[PDB]
C-alpha cells in the first residue's frame, strides 16, 4: 500500500486553525474599517 503526501508542506505550519483564523480576521478587519471610514468621509464631504 502506497501513501502519497500531496499537502504542499502545510503540515509544518503550527496551530493551523489559529493561523488561518488570524489571517481571515485581519482581512475582514481591513475591509470593514476601510469601507466604513470611506462612507463617513463621503458623508462629511457631502454635508460640508
Amino acid at each position: 500500500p502506497v501513501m502519497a503526501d500531496l499537502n504542499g508542506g502545510l503540515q509544518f505550519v503550527p496551530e493551523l486553525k489559529e493561523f488561518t483564523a488570524k489571517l481571515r480576521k485581519e482581512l475582514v478587519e481591513t475591509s470593514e474599517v476601510r469601507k466604513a471610514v470611506s462612507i463617513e468621509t463621503a458623508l462629511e464631504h457631502k454635508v460640508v
Binding site: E40, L43, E44, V47, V48
Partner: protein
C-alpha cells in the same frame, strides 16, 4: 467642546476635546456625525400623562402706565 468618558461610578471625566473650524460651508459635520452615530441625552423626562393643576382667570389693567413706570 469637551469629550468625557463614563466611569464605573457613572461619573464622567474629560479625556479630550472636540474642535472643528471651516470656512464657507453648508452645515456642521460634527453634529451630523454625532446625530447619526450617537444618542441624544435629554434632561427633560415626561410623566406618563400630564397632570392638570388648574385653570385660572386673569385680567389686564385698564392702563399700562403703572407697569411702565415701575
Amino acid at each position: 467642546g469637551p469629550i468625557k468618558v463614563e466611569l464605573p461610578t457613572k461619573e464622567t471625566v474629560e479625556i479630550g476635546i472636540v474642535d472643528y473650524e471651516a470656512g464657507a460651508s453648508h452645515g456642521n459635520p460634527v453634529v451630523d456625525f454625532l446625530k447619526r452615530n450617537g444618542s441624544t441625552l435629554e434632561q427633560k423626562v415626561n410623566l406618563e400623562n400630564p397632570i392638570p393643576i388648574a385653570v385660572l382667570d386673569s385680567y389686564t389693567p385698564s392702563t399700562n402706565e403703572p407697569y411702565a413706570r415701575v
